[PDB]
């Protein structure tokens, strides 16, 4: 477990991985960022059998410099920074409002939320004005952020202060004249340690899920006041739960990523008993994201520096020990291109099987596993 020797191993394996790319990928794009980004999200839409698409990125300068919220464009077959907007503190997370992608929410300095309206400055390569609204309740930084898919303008945040705030920005006028302050519509105190991740249900106005270092998975009904209890609350793992994600096809299915190196699958109608356990990561699992194109497909990321793609439809398939040696049947693909902990990842909603992933060493990768493998 030597430090400079582990690095030696990492660099050897990465070299080998680079030689094997033509056997594993249809597409690999690697971009070294000036600063690390903690967040990445594909924008919907596109503009020689190629197209130009956009990503939402951030910076982490850690107090050393001006931070920016960033929009990048990339040319994909079927990377450069085109806009930088002043941001307060590290961009811990950045998500576009699904009903209108010009509206961006972020989590920044001291756990302030921020709102940006990209429509007020389409042409400016650099936007010095910064944010149009500041969401002011949280007292510690955090990474839990998600928009409501049914009720436009509603979003939620969760941070290290262990609270969850629900916000509503519908109808609030934004302009370059100044930033407005926004107070939460609700704040819930239902966790006993940092809220790591949270998500609104795709098909329900008031169903919010959250996970925490306190090991619980909770379901909240946002129509109820904070005096009320969580609608559902179970211990999901024995160790911190880092991510949570609803399946976009199956309204009862969700996944949790835990520090116990596993991903657990759950049905809302039976949270007292896990559906299945995905094993194969060697360290804390952080990110979990369902494919927006294929119901049984999800992707996870880990401190073990790997991104695994899983196929739930292969669960329980029989295996000659000649393959029981190299992974669970449901483990469809492993991305070994990152040489450090993976920070965030995003399915491209525009193209089949295209992913973006970020690691702690300033590397953004855009990749597509070989059709020879997924077909």
From TrEMBL:
Query: What GO terms describe the biological role, i.e. biological process, of this protein?
Result: CENP-A containing chromatin assembly; chromatin remodeling; regulation of DNA-templated transcription
- WD repeat spans: 234-269, 278-320, 335-368
Q: What subcellular locations does the record give?
A: Nucleus
GO MF term set: histone binding
Ranges for the Histone-binding protein RBBP4-like N-terminal domain? 12-78
Q: What is its main location?
A: nucleus
Tell me which PROSITE patterns the record gives.
WD_REPEATS_1 (PS00678), WD_REPEATS_2 (PS50082), WD_REPEATS_REGION (PS50294)
What are the record keywords, sorted?
A: Chromatin regulator, Nucleus, Repeat, WD repeat
GO CC entries? CENP-A recruiting complex; cytoplasm; kinetochore; nucleus; Rpd3L complex; Rpd3L-Expanded complex
Q: Which SUPFAM superfamilies match?
A: WD40 repeat-like
The protein, known as: Kinetochore protein Mis16
Natural source organism: Schizosaccharomyces japonicus (strain yFS275 / FY16936)
């Amino acid at each position: 477990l030597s430090e400079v020797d582990l690095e030696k191993k990492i660099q050897e394996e990465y070299k080998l991985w680079k030689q094997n790319v033509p056997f594993l990928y249809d597409l690999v794009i690697t971009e070294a960022l000036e600063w690390p980004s903690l967040t990445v999200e594909w924008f919907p839409g596109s503009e020689d059998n190629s197209s130009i698409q956009k990503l939402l990125l951030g910076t982490q300068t850690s107090g050393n410099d001006q931070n920016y919220l960033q929009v990048a464009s990339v040319q994909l077959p079927t990377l450069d920074i085109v806009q930088k907007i002043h941001h307060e503190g590290d961009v811990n997370k950045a998500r576009f409002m699904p009903q209108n992608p010009d509206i961006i929410a972020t989590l920044g300095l001291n756990g302030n939320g921020y709102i940006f309206d990209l429509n007020l400055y389409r042409e400016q390569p650099i936007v010095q004005t910064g944010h149009q609204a500041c969401l002011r309740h949280h007292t510690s930084e955090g990474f839990g952020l998600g928009w409501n898919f049914i009720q436009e303008g509603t979003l939620a945040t969760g941070t290290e202060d262990t609270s969850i705030c629900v916000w509503d920005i519908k109808g609030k006028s934004l302009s370059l004249e100044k930033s407005i302050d926004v107070a939460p519509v609700s704040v819930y105190h239902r966790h006993t340690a940092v809220v790591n991740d949270l998500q609104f249900h795709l098909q329900h106005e008031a169903l919010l899920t959250s996970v925490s270092d306190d090991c619980t998975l909770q379901i909240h009904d946002t129509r109820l006041p904070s005096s009320s209890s969580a609608s559902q609350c179970v211990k999901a793992h024995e160790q911190p739960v880092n991510g949570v994600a609803f399946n976009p096809f199956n309204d009862y299915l969700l996944a949790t990523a835990s520090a116990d190196h596993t991903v657990a699958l759950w049905d809302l109608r039976r949270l007292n008993q896990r559906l299945h356990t995905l094993e194969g990561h060697e360290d804390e699992v952080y990110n979990v994201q369902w494919s927006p194109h294929d119901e049984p497909i999800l992707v996870t990321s880990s401190t073990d520096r790997r991104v695994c793609v899983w196929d739930l439809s292969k669960i329980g398939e029989e295996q000659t020990v000649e393959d029981s040696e190299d992974g669970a049947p449901e483990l469809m693909f492993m991305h070994g291109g990152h040489t450090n902990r993976v920070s965030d990842l995003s399915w491209n909603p525009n193209n089949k099987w295209v992913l973006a992933s970020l690691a702690d060493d300033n590397i953004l990768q855009i990749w597509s596993p070989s059709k020879v493998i997924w077909a």
